[PDB]
Amino acid sequence: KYTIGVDYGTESGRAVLIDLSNGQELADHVTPYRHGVIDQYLPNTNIKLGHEWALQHPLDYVEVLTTSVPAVMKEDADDVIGIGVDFTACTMLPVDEEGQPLCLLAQYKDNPHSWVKLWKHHAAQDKANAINEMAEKRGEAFLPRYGGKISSEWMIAKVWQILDEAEDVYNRTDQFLEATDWIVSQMTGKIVKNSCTAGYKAIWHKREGYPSNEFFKALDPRLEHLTTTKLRGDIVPLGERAGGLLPEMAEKMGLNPGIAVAVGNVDAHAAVPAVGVTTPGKLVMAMGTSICHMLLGEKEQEVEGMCGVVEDGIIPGYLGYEAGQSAVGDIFAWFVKHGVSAATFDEAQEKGVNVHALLEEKASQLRPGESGLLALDWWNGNRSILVDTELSGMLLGYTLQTKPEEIYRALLEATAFGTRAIVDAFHGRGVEVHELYACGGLPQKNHLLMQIFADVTNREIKVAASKQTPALGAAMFASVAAGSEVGGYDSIEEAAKKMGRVKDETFKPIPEHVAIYEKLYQEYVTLHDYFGRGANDVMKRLKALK
Amino acid sequence: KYTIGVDYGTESGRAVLIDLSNGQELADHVTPYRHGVIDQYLPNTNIKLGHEWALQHPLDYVEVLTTSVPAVMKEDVIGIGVDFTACTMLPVDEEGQPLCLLAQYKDNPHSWVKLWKHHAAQDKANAINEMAEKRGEAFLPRYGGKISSEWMIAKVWQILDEAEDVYNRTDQFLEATDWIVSQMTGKIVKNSCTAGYKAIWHKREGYPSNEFFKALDPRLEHLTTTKLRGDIVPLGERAGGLLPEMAEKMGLNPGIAVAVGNVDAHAAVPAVGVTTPGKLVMAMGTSICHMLLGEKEQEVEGMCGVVEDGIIPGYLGYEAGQSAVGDIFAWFVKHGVSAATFDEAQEKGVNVHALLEEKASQLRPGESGLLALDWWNGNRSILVDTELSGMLLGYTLQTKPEEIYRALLEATAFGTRAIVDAFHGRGVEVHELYACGGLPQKNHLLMQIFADVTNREIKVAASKQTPALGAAMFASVAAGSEVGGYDSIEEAAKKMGRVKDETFKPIPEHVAIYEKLYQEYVTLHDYFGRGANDVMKRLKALK
Ligand SMILES: O=C(CO)[C@@H](O)[C@@H](O)CO
């Protein structure tokens, strides 16, 4: 008895058939988008794309289904009770009355604004700016729910750009859709929007709904009624049944028609249940280029600098919290490409090892505090708790003897202090954090990072055991949408007890370490506040010169 | 006519022959100290010099004279002079020979020459300052509020506290620069420079009172009139005539003028043509020694010291310094510059430092977006705090090697501005800058940044052996105008002071950007080093 989770990424999509009793995947096949990311030119044309543009081809999404789901079936029958997907969040596209992408229409095929706008599409920053300006000026209740910053990557700004720069595309649009919802509408035939994206990317709230009709009007009179027209529809919680798989699609996929299809999920949020978290007190960290911190709570609290909070946003029956750490994995990448000497590089090749690996081993010989170094993990600004892109990195404690492995550890330590700033911001507001859960590739290749993390927050850290976490998550909600009656489950908690996967070995704080780090952290907090809360804005002035 | 200048460094002494008519080097020879730097085990023995110990062998200095001077002659002279490293002392007997040369004392490491690098006397120095503070000793200010572990007193106190037998057997402690000149003339005459900057000597008031030293240790009362006794004579004064059996062994006429010993940094001032106030001389190298002249003694925050006749007779000579400048750049190449940059320099067949200067060279002030506190090795001037560390601010995912290299170059220019500004606006004015060392020769970008940050024109040393020329210039003054020399260092410099025709002038728009960056520098400089946040010290503690 299994379900299928289709994990749609930035470059490719992949299907995984997961066993509904243990959570193991016996088969997965990834289908790359044959148009990939459209950042240079529209599919086989010479219509150049402006600055900060990211687009994608709608059909590549359906092709993952008509290619990968069949392939996974090959490697077994009608014991596939359901299918679900996770998508990169706020990857929207405008569709017609029949629910098809405008980019597929004769007239619109050549207007860039008719295509899919990838999450990475940052072209609408100015609109995101205005939306935040008006919300501030107006004093809108939703503003603090997103830390006082609606991203350019999200829905409202993205549609407003279309309206302005391409009004003909706007009016032609019957409804704008998150790619996660659109994709399920192609397997089900109906449009049913999930709670995760509406909540985190479309300024939605379960109790107040969307912002006032007056709020949008004050952005552009045309935008009044947007919420009841181009963004109309019931918001339904994760795990619910979008509807049945269409027979014509079922044929193309190797699946039976009518089987349960869950409402779209988001790649990051989908990780929470895949790692067994379906209750408060446990923070989940999707760790990689940066970290997306997610946490469940029983009450709504306006945590400083959080990215968002929404009921049924992550786990039905709980408020979902999301926070973000701007740069962690990127900082280590930066340091290897621009900050580590050739000597350590030679040393690494000298012993047949990768430099990252050599740097980790050498820094693990150091005792916390031994380097005498302290850093502010702000190489790429700050999102959570400080919400300021106008901040830079700092390294302190240099002596003529400072070594690359020492400064490397400082960067590791700095990111952990950054994570702690976030965990304390929640905990100190009632949104408790007792345990840490890590998923991603970072906790795989870098054990030292996980130990510093455990030492600094003084909390036990579990690591995901699944290879394809987001996919498992999708598979999990697929079973919940299926139901107990057909072999699946009646709740994500129940589904989590048997499907959730964490590695048996966890990282535990070493009291001797937790003690040194407590002191190093206090020094970090102080500089964090000095350089980031107003006393000295030198960082901002340094940028203005650059 | 010609005089010889002998420049004794930390590992080698170099003899140079210069033309008293224009101060042009025409021959020079360098002889490395046979026993180099004694700092692990005493010469062939298992005597481990544990701790921050640094000794040296006294004959290695005379070995220099009896090698390089004869050499320079083969490859007349009116006089000779020397410039030595600052506060490299040794105890001698009534014959003026070092105790380490005595069979029954060589094994004790406290009978050897204590090199300036010797830092094992910190505590004795801490006690000095503590006592000096508790007493309100008027000399403490003259040295920026902190006497060094490298200087004479702390060193003589360590010897007493630890090897009281060496102290008692010691007839007199002497500065190497004073000792070496004694070997040439048989007369022991102590110069004002080393007595002033080290040994707490003041021209008008003299040494600190007997009570002060007594207050340190009863045994030290009278130190000033026994083990450190002696008249202090100003630079350029004739120490005596060369001894008969010294001259033949050196290949020079006996009786020639042998000027009182000089110090490498200080002797650089007249060599660059500076002999009056308003002109700051920077001997720029691994670190930087800032030297300035003035008429009225002024208290200046964080100065190393100020002494009448300490540099040029008839003036108050001020000294300030920067812990690390060249060392920071070196630390960067060795531990902070990416292999990518290393490769590029290689494929282009040029030093990585050179590539880094060129790439950094293309940026405009403020273009890097970086700011640094040049305290990798703490700071000496104006703050006088060994317990401070470096900082780098402004990193982004796109920061590049040459950008942080630019920030470091700039950080050291800011540190120098702090120094010059401490002098200026305090009475001792700085209208011009003069630079010596390798950096002025090896890094033009740094010279221009200094120009733009300090907003002062900068002239560069024209000689290749600036210190040697200085010692040589003084040698001429010590032989008078009667036999081919000068009656003063002023006249001598009017013709021997060498400065390159090409000077670095401040570029208006650059000074404006730097006036901006400097203020940011000052804010952090005060935040991290003046009391608001002592995280550097606490961070050091957890080390
Ligand atoms: O919305 C998100 C992050 O919350 C996802 O689309 C990520 O894949 C973006 O990197």
From Swiss-Prot, chain B:
Keyword tags: Arabinose catabolism, ATP-binding, Carbohydrate metabolism, Kinase, Nucleotide-binding, Transferase
Coiled-coil ranges from the UniProt annotation: none
Superkingdom as given in the UniProt entry: Bacteria
Pathway: Carbohydrate degradation; L-arabinose degradation via L-ribulose; D-xylulose 5-phosphate from L-arabinose (bacterial route): step 2/3
Any one annotated GO CC term: cytoplasm
GO biological process: L-arabinose catabolic process to xylulose 5-phosphate
Transmembrane segments: none
NCBIfam families given in the database record: L-ribulokinase (TIGR01234), PRK04123.1 (NF003154)
Family (UniProt): Belongs to the ribulokinase family.
Protein name stated in the entry: Ribulokinase
